[PDB]
Ligand binder design. Structure first.
Ligand SMILES: O=C(N[C@@H](C(=O)Nc1cncc2ccccc12)c1cccc(Cl)c1)[C@@H]1CC[C@H](C(=O)N2CCCC2)O1
Ligand SMILES: [Cl-]
Lengths: 298, 302
């Protein structure tokens, strides 16, 4: 029993964190095979013009108490790739994957190439993450684990004025309409990840919380009309299909659970809580719920 | 900016998780140097869990009855001893991944990270607090016994908890790494119940200072309170008494924000009376009590 916001074990990623210093700026890098990946802002910026002036020896890379020697450098979108002379002996089996809004991942927050904490979070529909980052956290990475393979999906680049965070995939493409420059940028109006709230309601049912259940069902169209009124993301047939296993395990049809969600949106919780929360939680995917309520290991 | 429930990086602990099997029972063990620590109930039988005599069950065992597996490698048990509710299995190999470590016993209100494991394999990491009733609100399934709680301040791992059982309310009970239970619990299937739980007041205050640090001030008021009047009000909402030690501990946060502890106490009294009125504090509609004053300083400053 119990339901916690759970991150993946971070050990495979900890063995990849390095410190990258260029001039006065120090941030984190990801050392995989013989390449160190880091945000290109470590160097109104013209990154090609700034990079052409830098030599390999201008980049100081430190893995623990060992200085790695940079033998090449190149830029791919907003990520800088520093070729080093040594392949990381701790390089795990990995992939670079780009995620969709609503998908969750673990973040290993780092400062000076040293991991300080690990937390779980979701890519918001407005492409920001509600992270916990201070100055020097740039280059910290987001990941998931599938059996023994680490899928890297995020690299931290910046904080927006509202306290939320923006970054890229490991190929340097930003999530959202953001640019790596000190300029006026703002996160768009955010929405609630509907499929994730439903997954969390199924997690509460599996954990013995049933007060919000009712005899009613609804249509996909009727529910989307309601969800649009409360700034909730539209629920698709794909989402309904994905929730199938949880619907079969609890005996509560996905549209039956939608009628519970509609009643909670129109009437509130009335002093009650669900899994120790007075708000509807949207940072657990249907897969996260199945993984935690079944105990999958890595 | 931001405030998340943050766990310590688990890598140093992952390299210590092993699987311990005795008979038909399999659970997790903690391999440090040449010793594997695990709950002693791994030696129990299905028919003897109400009143097990662990000394009598252990005397009948030999080293080869304990199967210890570290990854795909079987470790050889060369000795065994019991210390309170923990079984210590001496093995013929020191763990090359043994980090710098200490065994620490924590007090209620203290937080730690949990590396939940099944069959010696880590499945997840989450943040926890030792409740005032000495239970933890964890997320554990059958076979999670032996999973450990820890803090990693600097490069040293301080092991503070080992999971032993789930009580009927869905909460969890366990021991320190010396085998002493937290709370009035025993490792028997006899009727046991967690005592009435209360809110960790010093932690809620720490989290209110964290909200002030991140720019949230809506909940502050022009009032103050004596410590005794605050405690008279707090007890009515099932909040733990706030001691002078707690007031002293909150001193640094008070100096950083410019809000006296007893003024923050008056803001908490008002929140307990009024609720949040559709508002949130650090993205939460409830008053959070699983961040200590130390956690707030570490996450907000470094
Ligand atoms: O409940 C069991 N074990 C313990 C326990 O509480 N385990 C668990 C921990 N966390 C979460 C859990 C969620 C769901 C089910 C179990 C959970 C337990 C019970 C009572 C006293 C002690 Cl010290 C330990 C079952 C039934 C007996 C079997 C067991 O441990 N055996 C030893 C020898 C013969 C089999 O496993
Ligand atoms: Cl303590």
């Amino acid at each position: 029993s119990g339901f916690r916001k759970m991150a993946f074990p971070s050990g495979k990623v900890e063995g990849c964190m390095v410190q990258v210093t260029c001039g006065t700026t120090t941030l984190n890098g990801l050392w995989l095979d013989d390449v160190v990946y880091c945000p290109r802002h470590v160097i109104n910026p013209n990154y090609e013009d700034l990079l052409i002036r830098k030599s390999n020896h201008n980049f100081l890379v430190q893995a623990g108490n060992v200085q790695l020697r940079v033998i090449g450098h190149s830029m791919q979108n907003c990520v800088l790739k520093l070729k080093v002379d040594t392949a990381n002996p701790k390089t795990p089996k990995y992939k670079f994957v780009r995620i969709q809004p609503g998908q969750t991942f673990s973040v290993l927050a780092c400062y000076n190439g040293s991991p300080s904490g690990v937390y779980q979070c979701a890519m918001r529909p407005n492409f920001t993450i509600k992270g916990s980052f201070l100055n020097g956290s740039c280059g910290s990475v987001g990941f998931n684990i599938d059996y023994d393979c680490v899928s890297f999906c995020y690299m931290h680049h910046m904080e927006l004025p509202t306290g939320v965070h923006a970054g890229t995939d490991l190929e340097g493409n930003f999530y959202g309409p953001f640019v790596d420059r000190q300029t006026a940028q703002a996160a768009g109006t955010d929405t609630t990840i509907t499929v994730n709230v439903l997954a969390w309601l199924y997690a509460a049912v599996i954990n013995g919380d049933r007060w919000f259940l009712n005899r009613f069902t609804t249509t996909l169209n009727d529910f989307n009309l309601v969800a649009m009124k409360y700034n909730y993301e539209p629920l698709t047939q794909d989402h309904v299909d994905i929730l199938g296993p949880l619907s079969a395990q609890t005996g509560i049809a996905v549209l039956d659970m939608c009628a519970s969600l509609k009643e909670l949106l129109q009437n509130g919780m009335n002093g009650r809580t669900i899994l120790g929360s007075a708000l509807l939680e949207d940072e657990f995917t249907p897969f996260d719920v199945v993984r935690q309520c079944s105990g999958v290991t890595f």
